């Protein structure tokens, strides 16, 4: 039944995987309003689509920047995968297109802001609050993994909160369609599984590790492995010694020891029973998996929204001209975008 849902999920995905959509809008169809967040290659803007009056979030990427950091393949992955998936907790790519200078991905605008923002402000999430979010990540990973995808960038900064208080996963920059192991050193330092750091070759288990980090950070208000510089963080991760807050439940601590498990033969999500080891853990006993999927659970926190266009849940950023050269940059490199 999940097998059968997943089965037909995979058909839908593969069709799009094999024949991706391209060139579904253009720059002049949108008025650009405000920057919602910035990134290594550009920025994301609140925009308003002229003909419909809908708001969207427009991810702008400078092709030259992308090339410079050798992120071509990853960027192509990001778009190919994003246009192909369909899940309740995955942000929807609405349009995509390119011009002389930039790549554009236009997504649904997730107005509630980043989980980050909320987490740092509130301090930490109660275990029931944390569990609500975690459940959504679990189902999402079950979905992605089933398609031979690895996500590889779980963190509060990549999780948006929608108007119903549910999660929208964003940033597929490191997502990859892989059968078997892969080797790229990528992610975010606090969230890296030891086997990435150790340059061993790794698989989808790294996502389950990250889940542990996320759940810890959510419930604690700080990550299990932190320091001033990435290098000291990696030391800690590798040791894998973890200390828990006084307030963590026994059940939580037990779940965490099994996710933050250096031994792949022992890590939850990577065993014979797979995800069911997670879904069936005592920490999730009160969790209604179907109701979560169906968005019937009432959320613990609902962002204030006043109107379409409201960016109150978002930090302010400095703005800058979008520039489009008269000459085509990196045309061949980005042919399939």
């Amino acid at each position: 039944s999940v097998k059968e849902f997943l089965a037909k999920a995979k058909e839908d995905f593969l069709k799009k995987w094999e024949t991706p959509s391209q060139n579904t809008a253009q720059l002049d169809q949108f008025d650009r309003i405000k920057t919602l967040g910035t990134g290594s290659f550009g920025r994301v803007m609140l925009v308003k689509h002229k003909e419909s009056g809908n708001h969207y979030a427009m991810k702008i990427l400078d092709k030259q920047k992308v090339v410079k950091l050798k992120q071509i393949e990853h960027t192509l992955n990001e778009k190919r995968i994003l246009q192909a998936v369909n899940f309740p907790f995955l942000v929807k790519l609405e349009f995509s297109f390119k011009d002389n200078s930039n790549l554009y991905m236009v997504m649904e605008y997730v107005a509630g802001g980043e989980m980050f923002s909320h987490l740092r402000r509130i301090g930490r999430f109660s275990e029931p609050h944390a569990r609500f979010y975690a459940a959504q990540i679990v189902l999402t990973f079950e979905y992605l993994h089933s398609l031979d995808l690895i996500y590889r960038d779980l963190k509060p900064e990549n999780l948006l909160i929608d108007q119903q208080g549910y999660i929208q996963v964003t940033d597929f920059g490191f997502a990859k369609r892989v059968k078997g192991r892969t080797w790229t050193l990528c992610g975010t330092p606090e969230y890296l599984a030891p086997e990435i750091i150790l340059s061993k070759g790794y698989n989808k288990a790294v996502d389950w590790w990250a889940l542990g980090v996320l759940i810890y950070e959510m419930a604690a208000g700080y990550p299990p492995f932190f320091a001033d510089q990435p290098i000291q963080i990696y030391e800690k991760i590798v040791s894998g010694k973890v200390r828990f807050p006084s307030h963590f439940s026994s059940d939580l601590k037990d779940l965490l020891r099994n996710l933050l498990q250096v031994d792949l033969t022992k890590r939850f999500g990577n065993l014979k029973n797979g995800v069911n080891d997670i879904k069936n853990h005592k920490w999730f006993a009160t969790t209604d998996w179907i109701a979560i999927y169906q968005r019937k659970v009432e959320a613990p926190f609902i962002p204030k929204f006043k109107g379409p266009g409201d960016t109150s849940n978002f930090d302010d950023y400095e703005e800058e001209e979008i520039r489009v050269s008269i000459n085509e940059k990196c045309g061949k490199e980005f042919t399939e975008f």
Partner: peptide, 20 residues
């Protein structure tokens, strides 16, 4: 406290991906 140590650290803001 761990919290205090976290909060005094240089990594309380949005964290950058790496791709080394």
């Amino acid at each position: 406290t761990t919290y205090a140590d976290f909060i005094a650290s240089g990594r309380t803001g949005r964290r950058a991906s790496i791709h080394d």
